[PDB]
Amino acid sequence: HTDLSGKVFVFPRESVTDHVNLITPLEKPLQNFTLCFRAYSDLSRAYSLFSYNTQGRDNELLVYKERVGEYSLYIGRHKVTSKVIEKFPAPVHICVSWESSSGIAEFWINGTPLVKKGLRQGYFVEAQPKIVLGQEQDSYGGKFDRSQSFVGEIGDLYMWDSVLPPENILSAYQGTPLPANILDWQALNYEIRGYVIIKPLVWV
Amino acid sequence: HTDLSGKVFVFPRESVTDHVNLITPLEKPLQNFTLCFRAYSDLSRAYSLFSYNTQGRDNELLVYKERVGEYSLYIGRHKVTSKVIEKFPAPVHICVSWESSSGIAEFWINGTPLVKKGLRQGYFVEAQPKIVLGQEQDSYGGKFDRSQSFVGEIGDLYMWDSVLPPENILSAYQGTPLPANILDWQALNYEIRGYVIIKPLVWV
Amino acid sequence: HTDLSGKVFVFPRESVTDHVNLITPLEKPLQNFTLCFRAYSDLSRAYSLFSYNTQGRDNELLVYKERVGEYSLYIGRHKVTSKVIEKFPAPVHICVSWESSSGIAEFWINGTPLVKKGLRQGYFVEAQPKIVLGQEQDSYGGKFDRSQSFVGEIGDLYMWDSVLPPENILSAYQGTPLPANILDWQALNYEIRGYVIIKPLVWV
Amino acid sequence: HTDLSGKVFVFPRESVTDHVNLITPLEKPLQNFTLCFRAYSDLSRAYSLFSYNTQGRDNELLVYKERVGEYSLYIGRHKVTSKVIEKFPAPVHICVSWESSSGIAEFWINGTPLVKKGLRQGYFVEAQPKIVLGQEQDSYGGKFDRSQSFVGEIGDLYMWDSVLPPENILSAYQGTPLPANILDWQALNYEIRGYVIIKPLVWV
Amino acid sequence: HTDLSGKVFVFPRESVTDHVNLITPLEKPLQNFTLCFRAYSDLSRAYSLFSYNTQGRDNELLVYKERVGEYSLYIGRHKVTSKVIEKFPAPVHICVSWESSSGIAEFWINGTPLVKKGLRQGYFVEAQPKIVLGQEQDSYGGKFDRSQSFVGEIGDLYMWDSVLPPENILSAYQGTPLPANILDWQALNYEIRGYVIIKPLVWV
Ligand SMILES: O=C(O)[C@H]1CCCN1C(=O)CCCCC(=O)N1CCC[C@@H]1C(=O)O
Ligand SMILES: O=C(O)[C@H]1CCCN1C(=O)CCCCC(=O)N1CCC[C@@H]1C(=O)O
Ligand SMILES: O=C(O)[C@H]1CCCN1C(=O)CCCCC(=O)N1CCC[C@@H]1C(=O)O
Ligand SMILES: *[C@@H]1O[C@H](CO)[C@@H](O)[C@H](O)[C@H]1NC(C)=O
Ligand SMILES: *[C@@H]1O[C@H](CO)[C@@H](O)[C@H](O)[C@H]1NC(C)=O
Ligand SMILES: *[C@@H]1O[C@H](CO)[C@@H](O)[C@H](O)[C@H]1NC(C)=O
Ligand SMILES: *[C@@H]1O[C@H](CO)[C@@H](O)[C@H](O)[C@H]1NC(C)=O
Ligand SMILES: *[C@@H]1O[C@H](CO)[C@@H](O)[C@H](O)[C@H]1NC(C)=O
Ligand SMILES: [Ca+2]
Ligand SMILES: [Ca+2]
Ligand SMILES: [Ca+2]
Ligand SMILES: [Ca+2]
Ligand SMILES: [Ca+2]
Ligand SMILES: [Ca+2]
Ligand SMILES: [Ca+2]
Ligand SMILES: [Ca+2]
Ligand SMILES: [Ca+2]
Ligand SMILES: [Ca+2]
Numbered sequence A, B, C, D, E: 001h002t003d004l005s006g007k008v009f010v011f012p013r014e015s016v017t018d019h020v021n022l023i024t025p026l027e028k029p030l031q032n033f034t035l036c037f038r039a040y041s042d043l044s045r046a047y048s049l050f051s052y053n054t055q056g057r058d059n060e061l062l063v064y065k066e067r068v069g070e071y072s073l074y075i076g077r078h079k080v081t082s083k084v085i086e087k088f089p090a091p092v093h094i095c096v097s098w099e100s101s102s103g104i105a106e107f108w109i110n111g112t113p114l115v116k117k118g119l120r121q122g123y124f125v126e127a128q129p130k131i132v133l134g135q136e137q138d139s140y141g142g143k144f145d146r147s148q149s150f151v152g153e154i155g156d157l158y159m160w161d162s163v164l165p166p167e168n169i170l171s172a173y174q175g176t177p178l179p180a181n182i183l184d185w186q187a188l189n190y191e192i193r194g195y196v197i198i199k200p201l202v203w204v
Helices: A166-173 B166-173 C166-173 D166-173 E166-173
Strands: A007-011 A019-022 A032-040 A047-054 A057-067 A070-075 A078-083 A092-099 A104-109 A130-133 A152-160 A190-193 A197-200 B007-011 B019-022 B032-040 B047-054 B057-067 B070-075 B078-083 B092-099 B104-109 B130-133 B152-160 B190-193 B197-200 C007-011 C019-022 C032-040 C047-054 C057-067 C070-075 C078-083 C092-099 C104-109 C130-133 C152-160 C190-193 C197-200 D007-011 D019-022 D032-040 D047-054 D057-067 D070-075 D078-083 D092-099 D104-109 D130-133 D152-160 D190-193 D197-200 E007-011 E019-022 E032-040 E047-054 E057-067 E070-075 E078-083 E092-099 E104-109 E130-133 E152-160 E190-193 E197-200
Touching: A032 A047, A032 A166, A070 A092, A070 A104, A092 A166, B032 B047, B032 B166, B070 B092, B070 B104, B092 B166, C032 C047, C032 C166, C070 C092, C070 C104, C092 C166, D032 D047, D032 D166, D070 D092, D070 D104, D092 D166, E032 E047, E032 E166, E070 E092, E070 E104, E092 E166
Parallel strands: none
Antiparallel strands: A007 A152, A007 A197, A019 A130, A019 A190, A032 A092, A032 A152, A047 A057, A047 A130, A057 A070, A070 A078, A092 A104, B007 B152, B007 B197, B019 B130, B019 B190, B032 B092, B032 B152, B047 B057, B047 B130, B057 B070, B070 B078, B092 B104, C007 C152, C007 C197, C019 C130, C019 C190, C032 C092, C032 C152, C047 C057, C047 C130, C057 C070, C070 C078, C092 C104, D007 D152, D007 D197, D019 D130, D019 D190, D032 D092, D032 D152, D047 D057, D047 D130, D057 D070, D070 D078, D092 D104, E007 E152, E007 E197, E019 E130, E019 E190, E032 E092, E032 E152, E047 E057, E047 E130, E057 E070, E070 E078, E092 E104
């Protein structure tokens, strides 16, 4: 339980080895959830932001940037993509929620809502995951791909087991987030593997 | 008669099956009319916003987006198109009126008037329609086309049997519309067919 | 003598038949003159705004839009073109003057002066004209061309037999023009031929 | 000695004949010098702004616009070019200085300094020149080229036999220039040859 | 020890000969360091800003502009590149730091931080350098390349043997920098070789 307030992870080079493991207890399958964080990268190609796999299931929960201005969400291998107008390169605050009952996934880029899309209505996201920043898993905790690796900075990451209202998403964007029960940036359990450096956050 | 204030329809995936039926009594043929609503979609291709058919007549009244920045109005199979400068993707408030006596159709995008165009002077729009959101009809209530389907969110839909003055169009754009006698968002009769979800409106 | 204050002509479709005839006494050949009006059209091709012909002389005085951002003035079949930065589609207030003694023609788009150009120094523009909005004449009052027709809205048209100073051109742009002695929008003699509708001006 | 305050030269058509001769005594070779003026033209091709030749020497001192956003200075046939961000077409206030001792030529477009460049260090610009607006000389006062001719308006022209500090360049840009000892717009000796008209300056 | 406050070096032409040697004692290998300066050039090709070589080691420390919007840092032949949105041509204030312990290099363009990148973790930058402005060294003080030469103006150069905090980088950008212990613009030891002129700084 480490307090990373005002710090970021820095993945300072393209690689197939550098990454961070996020550790959560969880154990109960996910029905609703909201995830959010800040990222800053000048990659033009595609990259994984947040990779969440479980035993036997690739891309169980994956936030993945297709290209400038397109964000994709995977839920149990099914995919959904939404577009937004953004500058490049630029810092972004990404936030994504998904609700099993309706299947709706809303993206929120820099406090602006993208078009809602739907997938996997009725599905339950599997538990006891391996979660990875800086690489995209194609196995249970490994088999990475260099050309999907993330190069840049990530911080202010939070994950709740519910769907945040707009009022609460704004709070997170403005740096005063509600306390999170799946991943909290101020009490984070993480392993660093490879070349990842922790530095102060100087771009918000 | 359901009050959808502050809610929207969400057509969360491309399909040939998802759609909403709007139900109005009407019965008397339409001479003048104003239609308006909000839409938010990141489709680059063409799509139907509002499809209104009658027994034996395709595209009797159809609002249809050709491509970014071009809105078309069909009246009795005749078509008229007007251009506007818009960002993309972005939420839009569309509003369109048509007057039989003059044949003039004015479009109003986000409270800005497009160039007036004319068609079907003297025509009477047929009554007892089937009205459909989220798909484009090529029959009396069906025979849809996937590549014309609407994917995104629609709300704040109103339809009057008269032509609104500018003062009243602004009112609708600003969220304080006059009460409507053909379709009112606050007392709406609708059927949902397929995958359509109702959610709160978070983008105005 | 009809007062069209706050109204516009609407040429609502492309055609070779719709047009308006403007009627002025004149009778004395034109030495100096200023013309101005508002127009709103989303045509990308070329079109005639103001066509003024006399017996035996085509394009005696013609204001003609070549393409987006280029305005041409014809004086006795001689042509002159000036460029400007404009958005599209957008409403414009055009104003053009010409002085025989110097041959100089200045264009003024939305109150901004274009580069001055010269032509026909010493020429006298012929009298007893047929003047036409919405079509381009290739005869004395007819032989139109569909692909030069104007589609959109025109209003606030004034024509003086002198050259307005800048102070007066601004006045016209801002909607408080000096009274005009060749064509006055507030006492206009006009015939409508074909499909032309008069509607209120809603875009200024 | 004519006062052209608030007036401009208008070169109203492309030609190989229209031009203005500027007349100065000078007689002593130029070591340092600053030149400046306003110009307004919608030509996309190359054109000469200011052409200064002497007996037996082409392009002794020549300010020449290569294309949109590139200004060239010739000093004794040697050339130097600097770039700037500008809108087009648009009025510009150009100002250029050159210092023999250092060879440095600074351009100042609309009160903004371009990158300094150098040429002809140690050179002395020849005296008893023929100076021409509106054409580019390839002889001592003539042998013009149509495709280098200037078409548009020029005014507020001043030339000093020293190098103005920044404070003084701003003054000239803002319309309150120091009195000039080589060419002064308020006491100018000029011949008009061909089609050149003097009109009031309406674009500053 | 010369005070260049409010002056710049001007490399006024492309060449393989013009350059400036910067002289520092140093002698102790560099572990951390921050470098910063202002530059103004309208070159579209690549150029070296700051070239620092040591006996037997090319590109030991090199700041090098790849193209518009891309800045590269070399540390012991290894390279790292970061992107930024900039206008062109435009004056820029560049500032770059590097820390051996972490290998992290941060760029700061006009007071804005680029994405951090990493290289040469653990490395020690060699001492007793030859440092050169206006050319890129491929030997110990020479063997230049014309097509990498810098053409424009450089000034306000400072270099510290530590890593400046953000607060101090802002100070340097705003013209009130902390005193520097490797290179100080207000006490600079430099040789000028070739065509380089010192002029006042007129573009900040
Ligand atoms: O990698 C993933 O888990 C998913 C998530 C988003 C990107 N992606 C893709 O599958 C896109 C390409 C993946 C791998 C790939 O391109 N190929 C191409 C040849 C073999 C290999 C594969 O599909 O297994
Ligand atoms: O579908 C409509 O009702 C109208 C309204 C806007 C688009 N549209 C069109 O007709 C354009 C194309 C429609 C369908 C189509 O393109 N084709 C082409 C082959 C079969 C099918 C048809 O003509 O029935
Ligand atoms: O119509 C006019 O009077 C002037 C006004 C501006 C354009 N224009 C033209 O004449 C351009 C071309 C007009 C007609 C045309 O293009 N052609 C091409 C072949 C037959 C026909 C003709 O010149 O008679
Ligand atoms: C998820 O949210 C829905 C909608 O509020 C709710 O009905 C359900 O009980 C929630 N499930 C869990 C596990 O929190
Ligand atoms: C439609 O509006 C026109 C005014 O142009 C009016 O004359 C007519 O009575 C109206 N008809 C209906 C059915 O509202
Ligand atoms: C036209 O304008 C010129 C320039 O002032 C003037 O000399 C002349 O008298 C005017 N003639 C007419 C008929 O307006
Ligand atoms: C030109 O300027 C230089 C430097 O400012 C000066 O030394 C010299 O006296 C000047 N010469 C003339 C003729 O103005
Ligand atoms: C380099 O910076 C690190 C981090 O602050 C510091 O521990 C070290 O003493 C510095 N080394 C030198 C030589 O300044
Ligand atoms: Ca995978
Ligand atoms: Ca993969
Ligand atoms: Ca149809
Ligand atoms: Ca269809
Ligand atoms: Ca004609
Ligand atoms: Ca014609
Ligand atoms: Ca020449
Ligand atoms: Ca020539
Ligand atoms: Ca080298
Ligand atoms: Ca080299």
